[model samples]
Target chain A: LFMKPIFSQARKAPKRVVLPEGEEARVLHATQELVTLGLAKPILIGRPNVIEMRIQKLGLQIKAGVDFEIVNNESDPRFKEYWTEYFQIMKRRGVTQEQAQRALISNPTVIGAIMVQRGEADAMICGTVGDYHEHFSVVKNVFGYRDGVHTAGAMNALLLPSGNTFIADTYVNDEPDAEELAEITLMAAETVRRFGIEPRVALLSHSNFGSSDCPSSSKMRQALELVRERAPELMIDGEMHGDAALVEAIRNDRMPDSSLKGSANILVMPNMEAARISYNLLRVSSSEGVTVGPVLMGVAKPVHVLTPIASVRRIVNMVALAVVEAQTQPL
Target chain B: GLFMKPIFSQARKAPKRVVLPEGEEARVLHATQELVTLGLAKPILIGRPNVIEMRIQKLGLQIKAGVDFEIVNNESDPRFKEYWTEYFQIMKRRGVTQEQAQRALISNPTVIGAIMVQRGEADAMICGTVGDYHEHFSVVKNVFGYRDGVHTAGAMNALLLPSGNTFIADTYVNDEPDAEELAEITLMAAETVRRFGIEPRVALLSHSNFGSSDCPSSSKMRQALELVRERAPELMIDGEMHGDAALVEAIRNDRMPDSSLKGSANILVMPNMEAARISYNLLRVSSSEGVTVGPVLMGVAKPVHVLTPIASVRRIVNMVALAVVEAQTQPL
Candidate 1:
């Protein structure tokens, strides 16, 4: 079925977001309004007393579908159940139960990840309090990695603003070594598959089949061989430079017999350096599409809406997105 | 007036061609009938005695615009009088006398060159026949330089066919060039690119873009830049960039904002001839140069093109067009 069919269901109201910082209720309220109207559930993650005090002082009421929850002292019965699980995981990882419990109580991100982890919520959006690495630490420590996943491959699928093209993985991994590059290709295919796209991966190099001499040309060839060897079912070929990868007229003369020419869907770049430039070029110059993400991946739970700063409104939006993802995947 | 004026001038005539083969008359006559229908020009540069017979035998008609000249083979010519004076001056500078001039006639390309130059008869043409490099050099050294006020430069522009995109300067010169050769090439290419009418903003490419690495290409680019700075001084030049950094918009932002090229570069200069040739093939096959193509011989004294060994008539037509543009300009 098309996505529209499932989207029409009368979904639960948006969840509440507890603003981690003190003066974040206004932002949360704005996010809560937009997200709730768009069929998401938002829940603010913060201390209960502080949130109540902010609401009282700011003269705000819980909107129709949005609510706020305090992490450390949340009386919701499920909170106890999830915290028990968090403690058990921490002990297994060599952190003392007391340390894990204390951390999960004070750190709303941990509590939120646990919510998504235990299927109490659809998703978790954190990382406003720190950098990407710090945020990564929280997700890894709290949600852990998905089973059967070997590496955290961050990728993004763009619905280009131009309305004609879409590209992915522009933000993660730079100039990855051979093994990493291979995995990246697989990860990109997996992501596109989840979105129900027929996979046509073009492992992009700077030139067409030994046309230019650089280390990258051979590197791309190796990756193509690996793809052929390991995932033979895939429609994949490369060491093709950018222009040949697209312009069909040039293809007939240059690579007449190659299958990927003139038509390819997933353009898997050789490394992060290529991806960064190519993806950014598509976004900034083409005026064709919008780039959303570096999207999160390799987590064992539903999608999380992680922002850079721990603001109340961003959290609300994240929570709403999480709710939708949770509802769909039950992660 | 805009170029779109003229309301279809004379209904589009066919392209003009000049033949220098052994059986020139038959080929010219056969090709002329095709040309008359197609609206193209037909001119034969042939031996004088054979012209009348050739015309009568092939088409049952008298000659029209047929150029019969035999100076390269037999140099004692009425046309060689003024040409002899210039040849004497040239030979004397190399320590040869009038006797040497009479004897070295067949060996020299000046006889053929003077014939083409003195009579601006054909619009554009190529004549590197007599087929040895020494024979080719004598002809070019005697004839192939640009016109007045225009300087000469040599670059082999490989058309990535079908797409019509081009990568160039492979197979002409050899070795890793320092700054002087780089600047000279940039200048010639700029002046040579009259057909495309492109304002040349040259990129002296390296393996690294803007200090991303410390390779020979990067350092060579620095030398090229300094050389151009001392020489041309005003042409647009920036380089030592990777392919992505050169073409990709985002990478340009990160590495090349302050560049004078203004984010759009049309001419790309590779570090070596091999890279140039190899990259040309790569870009060509990538579907970058699509469908058809055009190439010109730059830096020669006159409009003499050395067509690729397997060149077709269609490509030869393109070479003629480039030679026409060369005829229009003067050398520096």
Candidate 2:
């Protein structure tokens, strides 16, 4: 189960090299450790010369199959060519030629997303660029949405050292509308399957199945219905409040008939606020869990996204996670 | 920290055999397995020598601590003479003499409660016994409310487990409370904390905090705090705006800061059952993490109370906990 196997090295490695510019050494060091201990192959992205010098300065040794790859945006032959092409596509949107050129060159995420779309890389993790708009703009322009994917969403593969839970749409989307929510649900279900998590998804809300009335509840109900209609084969339930999603005693006592009551693993929250807040609550209150990724999905290609606030270790973890997701993905 | 410890083990224990009658073995055996293993002490509350054995047999458990303390009515108790005297004083408004007493005992929980209480077999009384209200009322009326110091109002533990937050209430008394009902709830919560050996800091919950609105948001909390000074001067209470203020940092950081609670409150007393229900609902509905136990702080001197419907292992744990609470108040 993806829920059970998280934080364990037995799962596949993350393919995306996730990190800030100077922080690559830290991620590389950690990746070397995971690969040395038979965790996964570590891939680093940056200027090849800069990475080699940093690796040497950091006194790090890369393990076998743990390779470093670098592509300098300034030195690339495609940089000026692609920037001119990108500016033409967004010309109607009032994008200045300089903005487009900068987007093509300095934006590491945009460069990576383009690489992912180009099939030169298996997956891309970004967001080290200053703002969310700038970060997602790259994703939108380069990779866009995957076929049959209605919307893009983010989820955290919350890894409790003892166990793991996949929380979907914690970031990215704010209040995902019904259709968007439906997309989010399918995205989460698919992501969990790809991550090897047995998806007993609980669509978290402020009320149980029709036990309370509100716009949020109805939207979730509709979203759940859309998910069912679209992918009826998936195991999912919504309008389950937070506690009912986790506590077994409540399941046994109050909701005995609910199949997912005691065993729900994937928790899809109502909104970004609830998802982020609840996961944050669990993190601080439990304080022992290792949280990996605001793992982004529904893109035209696999592009794992990291929070700009993410630490260097978190970037490494997201990289390992991305590879694991990419390794099992059939070409 | 107190909020985080799983209290089902630390708070409650199961009871021993207090021989119940027929057609109730399912409840008994279920209670047995829970108490014996899952951190509770077991005691059967049954009647009749063969009836107890038959119930045990029906459930496929060989009775070990079986006692032949069979009682058909008031006429059967060796202590019936003294019991009748006390029963007369307690239920004088409702009934008259020895024959009334005998009739009451025929359907009373007294003989059962007294036997359990006197023999020191079970620590407390949990009613709705083998029979309905008519069958269990007298003994329930007769049983002490566990301790003398604290007012024994019926209480329930509302658990928001994922948050490790708990709330105790005057669930049995002050049914429809105004400002004064706030004091009772605070005292109940404080005493509950003390009983559980937890420091008593309370968050009096409402929809908003510190007058966040005009209608009633934080007013109820302000009024409650005012009464707490008069009624429970030594206790700590704060409220207004949801469970996060009462339990977690994320919500508290965003919502409440002017308050003295340093983002750590063990007891969260909701404005009413609605808020309490809503808070618990939030956990259960959102898949947060929760559990609830109740009729816990029975006012009876010896800790006799009613269990909530669908009394599972959790309720059994509460029953045992009432016993421990009762033991603290009583000498024996």
Candidate 3:
């Protein structure tokens, strides 16, 4: 239900995806897989010399210049255009044209992100070579936020053992306030709708319906209020515990009057601690489970970040996700 | 190599005396009969004699109350005065008078069982089948204070994961434990894992990995890691790590080279009850493959555990066996 539909729908119009860490072994392997499957048009970003050597050294079957596209930061034709856009965006911060051009040439992560920003590529996947801050800052600087989006959150998709997929959000927002949590909830709901599943969002906390009060629970309650005010049409209910959010019998027995019809497909955690720990636990604990994303949400453009130890299969999964995002809502 | 086999064997040597706070239920009666006949533990039920007899009659069990097992009524116990005096001394300043203590001991079976343990009349107590966690926990906490040098009590669950057995701590105890509390939980959880004859590779989990995020919980975990390192130098502990970095061997190797853990962490200590509770349920609810062992109260002077109301008879036997094993290993 998750990967197959996304693959077929993405193949309808294969989007151009820029893999910034092309020299990385996993990225090169995923590029081959993505291109061979006809899922997306692969644009590898790295020094041509290093990329070719690594591809050969890693025994990858992908041709550097023929089978898939390779874009060096210094040799790409859109260098001047991206430099101008990047300079225009950062010039007010005292980044001169020289500094901007140097950054564009030296930093392939920023270069790949600007390619997506300039519409030369549909999406950019970063964070393989660097940490979350490096890619998140680059994408935020280039892509900025969507309309009325104050911050970008990360939602991970988990295929549960119940044959159900659940979405958890704000893995990126470390200590989200009420407004930021509301933004994450709205972004997560819209993000999951692209997966062809109706989003039943649950704003999670330690308490259930005002039973316990703390800063986190209070923040979640405030976010629920703001979500009710702003995106009132979203299938969202919250300030509930994990059990009330997921289990049907417990939900029915405990929160009988809850607006949630059944198990929630989308869970909005109170803070990054809950979201991050819960997402990874769900990912590792489920025997045959599959986790997709840190699908960066609320960005003006489609950009995703892969963990440092992500496999080729996971990288390919993110590529398909990017293709689906580009097809559903082109920026 | 299952967990229960060793536990059952250890318990049969000199069976520890265990108190069942709820005796009117058929499952409790069935479990008591099994425990006595199997020589696992000496079952002591705290309830009305007539009520337990009626339940045993209805269940058609071939066990008698006074012969097969012991059932001491809270209302007619000879040691009621001793327990009431103890409770009065513990709660007199908290507005519980001598009269109130007597009434509480007579009415609440959990209080009665806890008092029995306090007086060495029982080795352990188990309840929470008929009440909520908070209610059951308050009764236990009021009667049995934290162990010596322990600030607060925590709960740990041993999950029979498909990957292997993993222990998660503070599942139903602290809401948002500070650095000291988390360190205590880590030590307590590591001890529990060792009791099961498994090496404890402890992971203090949070949203961040080595100060990647500045959330309060993340910093708390880092502080807890530091505290554990300084206090328990012999223990294999590392953190302010994410769940994957702790649970996956490859990720741990790639992300954390200096980690004391060589593989997936056997004991995962969450930053707060939210993360702990959510993780435990997500892991348990996602697959019907795992078996959960606790809600075992840690830092208690005596061995006391709580079972979910829907626990089967086999689960009850396991809890009693666990209590016996715990009695054998005190200060744990």
Candidate 4:
């Protein structure tokens, strides 16, 4: 249910997506399907010899240059161009040409992110290994937040048996204030529309309709006013409980004047703690349902970090999300 | 089956005295009749006998004045002077006078019920259909300070989803608990789950799986995991994992092979108040077959529960059953 739109959208206006963990079996496996479906012109960031050897070992019938492309550190044709642009982007921020070469060479994550940064690839899916925070820091430095937006967040698309619900700041932001939370909501709502899902945004809190006046509820209420002022036509309301956000009857009872015609599709969580915790709890309990994300939100470019435990299907789904995100943005 | 079936069956074995402090209310009398009829509790009414009898008759109940159920007669109860004297001693160090304590006991039946539970005169007390949660919580917390060495008081929700019994905690207390406080919560939750005749397979949840990230939330959960182990190493518990990792044994094994929990975790100790509280409410409302039993107040010395203003007769009975089991003297 989640992949239908993004994957279909990718097939319509296919973009280039680079996978930094190219040697991983899941990556190679997903790469085969990506190539078969012509979903995106998949790019691999590994030595051709090593990647080809593993492709054979894994019995993968796909070829590197013919089907996809490999961007090995110093061996690729565009290595010098990648380094030059990387150096240019970092020099004012205290990085040197030597430092750029070493960092990009040592870490394939840096190479793929740099590819996305330079539009060498439309989107990059990296971080199948190493720390998530480490990978996110690299992506933050390369693309940063979108224009005039100070907060960068991620939303987990919870595909439940009932329907899809989006929960945000699950992968980024420690404690987002009112302005930052509003920023997350606006971009998250846009991304929902990008995925071809109607964005009924619920700025979630422990409080439902000012049921509590604690700072947490207060911040969400303030964020609601902030978002309403900006996107008045958007079907949105808050500060609401998570249950209120999901249950239609409870939601209508709480916000009788709410613009939302159904349960909220996008849940703008107050903080990363609530977002991440609730997302995980629901994801596992879905049983037959599947959840996709940290769908990167508020980023200037299409980039995503894969958890170390992400399966092959998850890898492919993220690639689809990244491609769709790129297609939604201005070229 | 819902946990209700098993809990209801269990309550019938040994009926415990559950005092309804708001016994003057028709809702309380109606629920008390069900408690008596179902053999779920030996209910004690701590309100005016005439008001209780009037309402009992109004509700078409066969409850006799002092025969079928005991009425403490709030304004003229023999125990009021005795209870107020004890309450004065308990609060006098903080400057509560005998006059104030007597006046408080005369007006409020909920306070009388708490004192009854604290003094072991009643097994448990369930009130707050009139007052909101905070007022009732403070009354009980004041009557019973943190059970011995425990420093935190919180609520645990026993959710009887279609899958089975799943417990979540700190739903009604502790905005952000430190490592040791979370550890105590874990231990208290484990004990509560055991009371339900289910061995607790505890999971301390966090966004960051394992020790992969050093965020305070994850690290504190990690610390709580170890602290709970030292406190009671026999319990099957693990954490600092995703919700998937906690439930799906394969994922947990692949991520952290040394996890003590070999099966799906039955209890989830959440990071903070919102995470715990919101998740349970969300799950309860969204899931078609989910039946939530309690925001079962824990860490207080005695077994004192709470009720909603609009709680149905069945919902009230469920709380009474839980209170009986909590007051049970025998092992599972």
What does each candidate score in C-alpha RMSD?
A: 12.2, 11.2, 3.2, 3.4
Which model is ahead, 1 or 3, in terms of DockQ?
3
Poorest lDDT segment (10 consecutive residues) of candidate 1 chain A: A158-167
Task: Compose the digit string of candidate 1's lDDT tens values, residues B148-201.
Answer: 443434455544322123335423343355556666676666555433545566
The digit string of per-residue lDDT tens for model 2 on B60-149 reads 764344332233333255655665566566656665676786565545544545545544655555555233322343455444433455
Q: Candidate 4 — which pairs collide?
A: none
Ranking by lDDT: 3, 4, 2, 1
Clash totals in order: 59, 57, 0, 0
| DockQ order of candidates, top first | 3, 4, 2, 1
| Native contacts matched by each model | 0.00, 0.09, 0.68, 0.52
- How well is each residue in A84-119 modelled by candidate 1, as lDDT tens digits? 877777777777767776766676667666766665
Winning model by lDDT: 3
Interface RMSD of each: 9.4, 8.2, 1.7, 2.2
Worst 10 residues of 4 chain A by lDDT: A283-292
Tens-digit lDDT track of model 2 for A1-331? 3333644643444354433342354555665665565544444446666766777788877622335455676677878766776676677777789998887666667566655665667765566434454577667766667776668887776544325667767657756788998888777777667556677777776456675456767888888888888887788776665556666566555567665644566777666545654554345445544546677877766566564345656655666666665665511
Q: On a 0 to 100 scale, what is the lDDT of residue A238 in model 4?
A: 80
lDDT of 3 by residue, A1-331 (tens): 4689878887889999998887788898888888788999899887889988988887878786677888987787778888898899889978899999998888888888888877889987787876787788878888888886778888777777555555555356677889988887787787777777887888887677786677888988899999899876788787876766777787776667777777888888776777888877777777464547777888888788767867787788888988888776622
Model 3 CA deviation exceeding 4 Å by range: A53-69, A75-84, A91-99, A206-211, A225-245, A256-258, A289-291, B48-51, B74-82, B97-103, B287-292, B328-331
What is residue A144's positional error in candidate 3, in angstroms?
2.0
Please give the C-alpha DockQ score of model 4.
Answer: 0.48
